[PDB]
Design goal:
24 strands, binds a molecule of 4 linked components (NAG-NAG-BMA-MAN), 2 chains of a larger assembly, 340 residues, binds a molecule of 2 linked components (NAG-NAG), four-stranded antiparallel sheet, binds 2-acetamido-2-deoxy-beta-D-glucopyranose, Neuraminidase, binds a molecule of 3 linked components (NAG-NAG-BMA)
Chain lengths: 340, 339
């Protein structure tokens, strides 16, 4: 063995070719809410994900406001902020359309669930991850980085600075809390990609991962969501080969982060940054995690130690330059795991 | 002399894929042309009265827009251009919703300067620009196209045709006219716009509607809103014509000159009588493939000359003939009479 690598894994559900599953939130009742980036910007609802073949249904298509959805984060219980924009095409390598990013709310405290525009954010480059402040959950932080001049045919790859916005979902007011940080930046060390990708908050520690340098970072944040001076990022862990996407603390209060990387998932010590691949490439179970994108732990007695992993690729490619989109959601049972 | 078809000549032809969309004539008489594709640019035609005049890229507006549509002069030799991001440079591509903007090209400086005047995300598709003659730092801007533009247009639900007032000094803007059948399209002429070009003469705002062949006008107050009850006056109707944009004149003459379906028309302001002067409908019927706008020369060499922009390679015989390939031409109107 219990806890041996590769950890036990199963497939919950697989979407058709062209469906890009990008992020995940777990509801208080334990069901999953998944964002998709293509073919449409939607949220899908996975019911009783601890069962063998859970039912899944479209919860809402956000076409009214966006072509694509990216990140999702819960605010007050069973309300969720999602982010997205218009995109030049549903193709996997398409850029966004500049100035079309927005934050929208999906309110599952009403049935049917209610949606609304929370904030157009034309000044952001590309909104990515969403993390509510634990003590003030109506306030969210949002990560932001991609090409500075997105166009129909991308030629100028000048990256925008990685940065993090504060959004007050009650008023729609937003402001930058952090920008101009090498730790949020990309230099395309890993090819065309982003710098800062997922963000998650635990207590008063804001964590993020960098897709281009394999760094995991954190910084202490004040009650208003701005960093505590001198606002210098603390390195948690560096695995230079890994194209980190998003992550989850836990389970429960284990001293660990669980992070999606390059066709694999890793456990990472919060104390000292020791990193161990637990499934996918680098283990004998090396075809089962093609292009994972995010992960979050279950929230019921059935699955508190189960890490639910989204992914967007049909098979493991020989090349990151010609992937094939076909999304999925899987489950990794972390019970008994130990770094060594 | 003055006979139809009026004398015409080509000043310059652009490569295939180049869509020349509108025109402003500078105080010194040179032409400033907007392009929609391949890029959003202004081209500068020097001494257009000469036989084969020189032309050059004045500014590429890529920093803010994939495409430019209309252009209108504000204070002397400053110009507002409008444009947005588009899903592709394909001739049939929709715009990307909420990316429209008005920018300024300042030709008083050397080299010409540019700035962003207003992002206008509430607008649907900005089209024609016309400054107020008594307050040229205020411009009216027409606006109509699909209500829900997308990567592959399937819902053709049209936006209401309307007109914005933009204060170029503050960047503030508000609607002054909306909810008018006369600015609307029902696609009587196929996928198109409703209100297209706008121009202002004195305190009279004119516009053409591309879908119903109508020419209209309303009186406007000094603050730029129409005089109540702001009912459009029908000026002329030619049902078959896909009007795009137009020019008053030349000089004192009681006429508008309007680009139509592969043709140009002179139109009486007093009574709306409409005479095709070049293109389809005259014996010289291939020389105006898809004209887009027109304005008169402003020098002693060409104040009776109507410079006409266009975006089509040739008059399309069938709907899959349409080849984008733009141009600028000149129609000498000297001696013309309605007859
Ligand atoms: C000029 O063209 C406009 C664009 O087509 C015309 O506007 C449309 O007019 C129709 C007929 O009245 C309206 O249809 C009704 O809409 C209501 C609901 O309206 C509200 O919700 C819609 C949907 O979000 C929204 O678009 C409206 O602004 C309202 O907030 C329905 O309950 C009726 O059953 C009926 O369908 C259209 O709603 C309206 N569209 C827009 C975008 O305004 C306009 O009538 C034309 N004017 C003239 C003089 O011909
Ligand atoms: C780097 O940090 C990790 C944690 O992120 C450290 O691993 C943890 O080490 C502790 C020992 O201090 C382990 O606790 C022991 O667990 C066993 C098994 O249940 C229990 O019987 C013992 O009484 C004790 O509690 C803990 O399991 C382990 N955590 C994980 C996730 O592996 C690691 O030691 C640190 N490395 C260095 C070099 O300090
Ligand atoms: C419809 O309206 C148009 C004007 O938009 C009329 O054409 C204009 O008719 C006037 C007659 O009052 C012409 O002006 C007169 O002719 C000459 C001008 O050199 C002069 O001898 C007179 O003193 C007076 O100015 C004007 O030239 C003419 N405009 C054009 C462009 O032809 C037209 O008669 C009206 N009706 C129809 C059926 O067209
Ligand atoms: C979904 O996409 C996958 C991957 O592109 C398709 O699998 C390929 O199918 C072709 C045959 O058309 C084979 O030549 C390739 O070797 C397959 N690739 C892999 C990795 O197996 C799959 O057929 C598509 N599914 C559907 C229903 O269209
Ligand atoms: C993070 O990335 C941004 C964007 O690449 C960097 O900002 C650029 O810095 C160079 C040199 O200092 C300037 O020439 C560019 O004009 C800047 N671009 C923008 C968009 O501001 C920034 O220096 C990086 N920060 C760190 C700490 O590495
Ligand atoms: C995606 O959204 C569009 C518009 O809302 C719709 O036509 C289509 O059926 C949706 N689903 C797809 C493409 O799977
Ligand atoms: C421009 O388009 C026309 C229309 O199809 C075509 O005949 C012509 O060859 C093109 N010009 C080129 C390819 O240089
Ligand atoms: C369009 O503009 C870009 C610069 O923004 C330039 O690289 C490209 O060559 C232009 N296209 C054409 C056809 O000139
Ligand atoms: C132009 O005129 C000629 C001569 O009558 C005719 O054959 C041709 O069809 C006309 N073309 C158009 C586009 O009207
Ligand atoms: Ca991501
Ligand atoms: Ca036009």
């Amino acid at each position: 063995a219990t806890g041996s690598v590769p950890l036990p894994e199963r497939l919950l559900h697989h979407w058709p070719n062209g469906t890009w599953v990008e992020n995940i939130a777990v509801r208080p009742n334990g069901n999953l809410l998944l964002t998709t980036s293509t073919p449409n910007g939607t949220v899908w609802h996975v019911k009783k994900p601890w069962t063998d073949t859970p039912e899944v249904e479209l919860a809402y298509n956000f076409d009214e406001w966006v072509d694509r959805l990216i990140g999702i984060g819960e605010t007050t219980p069973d309300k969720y902020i999602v982010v997205g924009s218009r995109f030049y095409s549903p193709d996997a390598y398409s850029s966004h359309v500049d100035r079309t990013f927005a934050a929208m709310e999906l309110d599952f405290t009403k049935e049917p669930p209610s949606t609304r525009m929370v904030a157009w954010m034309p000044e952001a480059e590309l909104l990515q991850g969403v993390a509510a402040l634990p003590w003030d959950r109506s306030i969210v932080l949002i990560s932001d980085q991609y090409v500075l001049r997105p166009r129909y045919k991308q030629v100028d790859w000048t990256p925008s600075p990685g940065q993090i916005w504060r959004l007050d979902t009650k008023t729609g007011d937003y402001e930058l809390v952090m920008t101009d940080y090498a730790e949020m930046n990309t230099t395309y060390a890993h090819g065309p990609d982003v710098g800062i990708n997922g963000i998650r908050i635990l207590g008063n520690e804001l964590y993020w991962v960098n897709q281009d340098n394999g760094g995991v970072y954190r910084v202490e944040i004040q009650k208003n969501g701005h960093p505590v001076p001198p606002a210098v990022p603390e390195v948690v862990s560096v695995v230079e080969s890994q194209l980190w996407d998003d992550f989850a603390f836990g389970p429960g209060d284990e001293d660990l982060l669980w992070v999606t990387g390059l066709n694999a998932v890793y456990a990472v010590s919060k104390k000292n940054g020791t990193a161990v691949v637990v499934d996918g490439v680098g283990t004998s179970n090396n075809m089962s995690f093609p292009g994972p994108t995010s992960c979050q732990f279950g929230r019921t007695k059935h699955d508190s130690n189960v890490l639910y992993v989204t992914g967007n690729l049909y098979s493991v490619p020989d090349s990151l330059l010609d992937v094939k989109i076909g999304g999925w959601v899987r489950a990794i049972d972390t019970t008994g795991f130990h770094l060594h």
